[PDB]
Amino acid sequence: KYAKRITEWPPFEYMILATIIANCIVLALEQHLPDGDKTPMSERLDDTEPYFIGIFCFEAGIKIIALGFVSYLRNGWNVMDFVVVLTGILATAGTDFDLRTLRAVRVLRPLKLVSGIPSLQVVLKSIMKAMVPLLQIGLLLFFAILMFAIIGLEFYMGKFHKACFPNSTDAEPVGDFPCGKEAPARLCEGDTECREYWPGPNFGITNFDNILFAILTVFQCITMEGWTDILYNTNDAAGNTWNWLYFIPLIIIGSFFMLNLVLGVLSGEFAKERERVENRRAFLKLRRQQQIERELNGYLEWIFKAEEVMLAEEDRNFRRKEKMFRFFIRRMVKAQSFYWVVLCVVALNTLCVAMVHYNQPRRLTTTLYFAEFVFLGLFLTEMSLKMYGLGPRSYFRSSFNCFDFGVIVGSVFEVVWAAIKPGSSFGISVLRALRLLRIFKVTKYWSSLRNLVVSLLNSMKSIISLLFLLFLFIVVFALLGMQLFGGQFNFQDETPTTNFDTFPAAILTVFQILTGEDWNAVMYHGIESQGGVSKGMFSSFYFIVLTLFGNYTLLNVFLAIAVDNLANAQELTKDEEEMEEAANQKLALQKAKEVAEVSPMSAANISIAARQQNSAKARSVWEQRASQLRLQNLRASCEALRRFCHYIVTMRYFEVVILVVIALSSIALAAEDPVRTDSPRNNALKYLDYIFTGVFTFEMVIKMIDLWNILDFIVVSGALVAFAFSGSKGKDINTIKSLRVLRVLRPLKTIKRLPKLKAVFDCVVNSLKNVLNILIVYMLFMFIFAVIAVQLFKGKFFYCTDESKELERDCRGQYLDYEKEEVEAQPRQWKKYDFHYDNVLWALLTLFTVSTGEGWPMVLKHSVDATYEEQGPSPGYRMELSIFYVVYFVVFPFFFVNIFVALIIITFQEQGDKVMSECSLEKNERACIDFAISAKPLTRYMPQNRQSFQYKTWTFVVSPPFEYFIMAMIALNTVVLMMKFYDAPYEYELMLKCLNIVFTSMFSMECVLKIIAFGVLNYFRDAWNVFDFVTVLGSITDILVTEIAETNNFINLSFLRLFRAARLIKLLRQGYTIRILLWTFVQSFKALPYVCLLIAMLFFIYAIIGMQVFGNIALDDDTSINRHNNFRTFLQALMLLFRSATGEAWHEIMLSCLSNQACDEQANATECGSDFAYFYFVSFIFLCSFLMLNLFVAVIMDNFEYLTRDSSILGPHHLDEFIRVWAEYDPAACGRISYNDMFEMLKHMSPPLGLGKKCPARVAYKRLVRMNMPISNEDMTVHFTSTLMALIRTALEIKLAPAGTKQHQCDAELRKEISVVWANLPQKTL
Ligand SMILES: CCCCCCCCCCCCCCCCCC(=O)OC[C@H](COP(=O)(O)OCCN)OC(=O)CCCCCCCCCCCCCCCCC
Ligand SMILES: CC(C)CCC[C@@H](C)[C@H]1CC[C@H]2[C@@H]3CC=C4C[C@@H](OC(=O)CCC(=O)O)CC[C@]4(C)[C@H]3CC[C@]12C
Ligand SMILES: CC(C)CCC[C@@H](C)[C@H]1CC[C@H]2[C@@H]3CC=C4C[C@@H](OC(=O)CCC(=O)O)CC[C@]4(C)[C@H]3CC[C@]12C
Ligand SMILES: CC(C)CCC[C@@H](C)[C@H]1CC[C@H]2[C@@H]3CC=C4C[C@@H](OC(=O)CCC(=O)O)CC[C@]4(C)[C@H]3CC[C@]12C
Ligand SMILES: CC(C)CCC[C@@H](C)[C@H]1CC[C@H]2[C@@H]3CC=C4C[C@@H](O)CC[C@]4(C)[C@H]3CC[C@]12C
Ligand SMILES: CC(C)CCC[C@@H](C)[C@H]1CC[C@H]2[C@@H]3CC=C4C[C@@H](O)CC[C@]4(C)[C@H]3CC[C@]12C
Ligand SMILES: CC(C)CCC[C@@H](C)[C@H]1CC[C@H]2[C@@H]3CC=C4C[C@@H](O)CC[C@]4(C)[C@H]3CC[C@]12C
Ligand SMILES: CC(C)CCC[C@@H](C)[C@H]1CC[C@H]2[C@@H]3CC=C4C[C@@H](O)CC[C@]4(C)[C@H]3CC[C@]12C
Ligand SMILES: *[C@@H]1O[C@H](CO)[C@@H](O)[C@H](O)[C@H]1NC(C)=O
Ligand SMILES: [Ca+2]
């Protein structure tokens, strides 16, 4: 039994890894066919299973006979291996048919190589240790969903079951939209009536019939996938007046707030983890290695200089004459002239390669073909001459030179491979555009951008491990999907492409679900495959998981990578700059030392050059927090007429009137009718615009007599020109429209007038300027990808209307469309796909749409189906091209976009301080003392009579079992709140109503008991008691309304039910970690309202612009501009803008209004719509994303002190416990309290602060004795003013004990730091 010492060798471990990889390949080679069909390879691979099972069992047996049982089973990975082998053995000996739950375990086999490689185990532990603090967020998220689900269950229960059945002939609805009989809901057209019962919108899956369906629908909504479809279904089922008030708060809270919480928690976790001893040591090693290299390079340059100096004096007096040539070459390959020449050559090559487009002239094609050879030869001659003038070892030292060599080799391979078989092309020749990255060399941003690449290369193994772990999880989920839905997607209609039949299809489906686009469609297909709504509805959980741990795990990989690398680069750059400054000042100070024969002026020179550059120390919040965390960790480790037109603008009440006129003009702009130009409202608006432009020009003309003013000049001049052209016929009506839409800039004038709005706009602009270099790099990478995509896909995105024809000449005439069983004659026409890659601009637009994530499966399908230059598509022709898109998703949406967030997180500047010299010592200590400054020991108001009646009620109410009963009563009432379902029996609804009755009665009894035991003016003091009373009163009003027959049409009262649905909030107070986080983030939100004002102004401006431009588009169904989504009104425009901001079909909306749309039969122009929608939508998406990210980072950095807590010396929270303890023992302040209570209070005090063990109590005595005593005054005196202050002073930054006599200086420091407190603490210092 000595297997461990003779059978646990490296080579045996690599034989077990080969068994696993082979098993993975066998699993990936399986194919699933419907209805029991099987390929011969299926049986051939099935015959391979028992050898794998035998090998696994042998390895398990060796490990058992080496380690024992319950220490071999003590490892979780060994437990997983044992479970896998046991399930395999049972399957081998299993003849019964209930093996599906056992054969689905063999998808965990790829996870076994995680156990075989401990490095992957360490990486997985590191990635999963940052997800525990996210769990509470998920809990909160679940609560939110539950709450919203309940609200849905109370409003949209069985509302989607009505449809326009024509005449009850065969019960086939004509339209897939809900009804309302008369009412403001949507009506049937033609000979149809809305009969009862029709499954629902999506096969009857998305509805609010019961709590489970409501929960699933709300979860689908929060992921912002198809929530607008549900919104429109509610709109046309019950009217559009109040449905937005349910979905807009739902989307906001469930997506934006959750994402902000996740980002903040992750940022705090990363900041805490970066300052650990291991990471700090690794960073110090990297910094030392980088610092050595600069000195080495300087010394080698010095050495080369001497080698070329001792070679000219050695020849001045064959194999030597060829070496001055090498020296001259090396002096030539390093000069600025050669650098600029090669940079211009690379720029010209980029220009030449960027002109490729579909249907280019043959002369241009030949010119580019020859220029490729010319450029390849030139680049080859610049890589050989620079390699001989520097040497192979010195040339390969720089990483970008290695990249250049790789690109040259790939280009040569492409050139030789493009002649022996000219088909498509890889596109490596475009990669030379990355050589433009030399531009940053001549700027001052070279060090910062180079340090990021240095840090990226330093931790390459970690990046590879993380990517491989992600790929392994994707493979495991693909195998699970293959087992669950493999071969079950063969429906009566066309089989969906997004299926789980083969391994490539399953892995593409899993990747698409990970991105989060159209995952609900795949979920619907899976549910339909598993039986439908009736049975098989439990197959959704898979997708649920694949969403959750698929949408918050990438944010834990790529965001972590970005934060770590960018923080490392920033710290490296800052340390390099400060070390250079220190070395320069030391050298200049030493300069004066050698010159002792005269008074030196070097000291003055270094003095005048030491403060001018000092004003560049930004010291962002992230850097300050990192420094404080480093200090704390190190301490813990160690311790173990001109005047008549200028006085009018000087008036105090002149800016306010201008602001109110600006607001009035903005409101008048909002309330405009685009579709009906000729209306009395439009005439009144024109008359008001006359007054507005008159007052604007009047105030403007008196301002020039004494950038933003430039904008005011354009506004005024455009208004004047429009008025001048108004008094004539329609001369150049397009110019009139342009000058009319120019008036939207009126709200922009408010930015300067409000100092706070101007400040926040300046902060946003500064944040934008902070990421300009990364934006340029991102644009260069996107351009390279777009050029490659143009090269790959130009011309191939053409298709005929019917798939039978493959050529343009064949796609002529008419064909038979066999849709909806009508076989209609439809014209054949050779069309082009909406999003293509004809030229670089179209490719850039398509890649932007892909990066946003909308409709990228469609472009993936089109790219895969593309065949040739002028030939129609063929399904699955080139599947490998999907790699391209995968790579794109790895680089832009995932990587590049996550380094934008990090670059804003780590460089965010504090705004509420605006100065770094306030106290230089307190960041949380100041807040900790201010908490005691403001929070007085508020009491619980114990009754003072206690004679016969009030004391009994008070004792009953404040009793712990009463609170427990209320909690159980509030938790059991929520169980009866979600237990309602559609088409329930009458007795069931009666029981539900009776239970609601008794619960409301119990809560009313509790409220009246509290009123009696506390008092009218005491119960209402609490903000929670008044909320409870409001909910009780609302429930009573609802129950009274319900008992009496409801007013059918007099007053529509159905909102009061929400009050009862509010009881959930009543149970939100039990959690001691969700309340303190929710309240903290809400209080940070309420402290930054001007960011929200800026976002609202952005939405207002874009809504007005859309109203003016695309307002009169004709409403048509089966499009993106219809009765649900249009630009007609201000509310409709805002809804469209919000839908695009979340992102549903913004590309489809853009295409639905481009310069050729059929125009409404009520407006003036017969052809309305413009090609301006491209810029409109792209700019709106970019700006909305940027401002939302800025708001998120502002909120996160407002709370960074709490998000990086490291809770062991916490002070902001222990004061709450102190107040809670003091309140119970104190009925009222009464000035002063006794002494003996404080000892039992310290005993009952939280052990985290004050006493850990029995021994530290002595230290507490050392804090009570051996210093100044408050016993000088009356012993009947409070001590909280002197106890908590002393404990918070001595817990951190203790100074009195080492001195023992310098108390007066500490008191003076405290006084000068509390200078303006209105002398309130002077009486508390004693
Ligand atoms: C940590 C998680 C915290 C979660 C907090 C959640 C906060 C947001 C909650 C949003 C709830 C308000 C929106 C209600 C959705 C309205 C749905 C609807 O269609 O209502 C119409 C309804 C009658 O339907 P109607 O079509 O008019 O008639 C035919 C069919 N009966 O009724 C009507 O006739 C109109 C009445 C509905 C519109 C007004 C309702 C009051 C809204 C006040 C503002 C929000 C109050 C928030 C209260 C929080 C606690 C619930
Ligand atoms: C990286 C730097 C050096 C590139 C600078 C920009 C140009 C190289 C790009 C930007 C605009 C691109 C143009 C974008 C739009 C067009 C129009 C296009 O012309 C046609 O499509 C005519 C055929 C037809 O539609 O019938 C030819 C490509 C061209 C000029 C592109 C050629 C390459 C251009 C000129
Ligand atoms: C300062 C910002 C928030 C813009 C103003 C807020 C808007 C949401 C409010 C303020 C004025 C409201 C407008 C107040 C007056 C009207 C006119 C109203 O139409 C009619 O009065 C019917 C008369 C006719 O049929 O001609 C339509 C709503 C509308 C523009 C309202 C739409 C919503 C508006 C634009
Ligand atoms: C963090 C990353 C690594 C996640 C994705 C891992 C990729 C390597 C996966 C996801 C997409 C997979 C691709 C999904 C689709 C295809 C096409 C397909 O190629 C075929 O020729 C299929 C053959 C057939 O038609 O039956 C299989 C390889 C490839 C690119 C797969 C290879 C492995 C890929 C590239
Ligand atoms: C001073 C501004 C900012 C506030 C007042 C502007 C809005 C509320 C005013 C300006 C002109 C007004 C319109 C003038 C004419 C008509 C025609 C008729 O159908 C009655 C209502 C209606 C449609 C008015 C509704 C209210 C209206 C749109
Ligand atoms: C790291 C950054 C700069 C990405 C640069 C590499 C990109 C452009 C490379 C990496 C892998 C490459 C793909 C690899 C394989 C194929 C299959 C071939 O039949 C067509 C080209 C295609 C689809 C390539 C296109 C270009 C591609 C996506
Ligand atoms: C906390 C959980 C476990 C118990 C409280 C949840 C109760 C109220 C929920 C959980 C699952 C729900 C059931 C889920 C499915 C159905 C089938 C439907 O055709 C009638 C309603 C019915 C029977 C639901 C009634 C309410 C229900 C029982
Ligand atoms: C002025 C600001 C928005 C700078 C952005 C300018 C560019 C991106 C925008 C501003 C106005 C736009 C124009 C507005 C209207 C039309 C008419 C249409 O039939 C063809 C396109 C064309 C000519 C647009 C092209 C793009 C355009 C020039
Ligand atoms: C069937 O249609 C006719 C007219 O097409 C109309 O009377 C009604 O909708 C139906 N007739 C019935 C229900 O008798
Ligand atoms: Ca979407």
From Swiss-Prot:
Question: For this protein, what is any one GO molecular function term?
Answer: calcium ion binding
A GO BP term here is: modulation of chemical synaptic transmission
> Can you tell me which residues are glycosylated?
167, 1052, 1164
IV repeat residue intervals: 945-1200
- From the UniProt record, list the I repeat ranges: 1-270
The main place the protein resides is membrane
- Give the modified residues of type Phosphoserine: 599, 602, 637
Q: Which reaction does it catalyse?
A: Ca(2+)(in) = Ca(2+)(out)
- Free-text comment about domains: Each of the four internal repeats contains five hydrophobic transmembrane segments (S1, S2, S3, S5, S6) and one positively charged transmembrane segment (S4). S4 segments probably represent the voltage-sensor and are characterized by a series of positively charged amino acids at every third position.
What's the protein called, per UniProt?
Answer: Voltage-dependent N-type calcium channel subunit alpha-1B
UniProt organism field: Homo sapiens
Task: State the gene name recorded for this protein.
Answer: CACNA1B
The part of the entire sequence present here spans 86 to 1837 of 2339
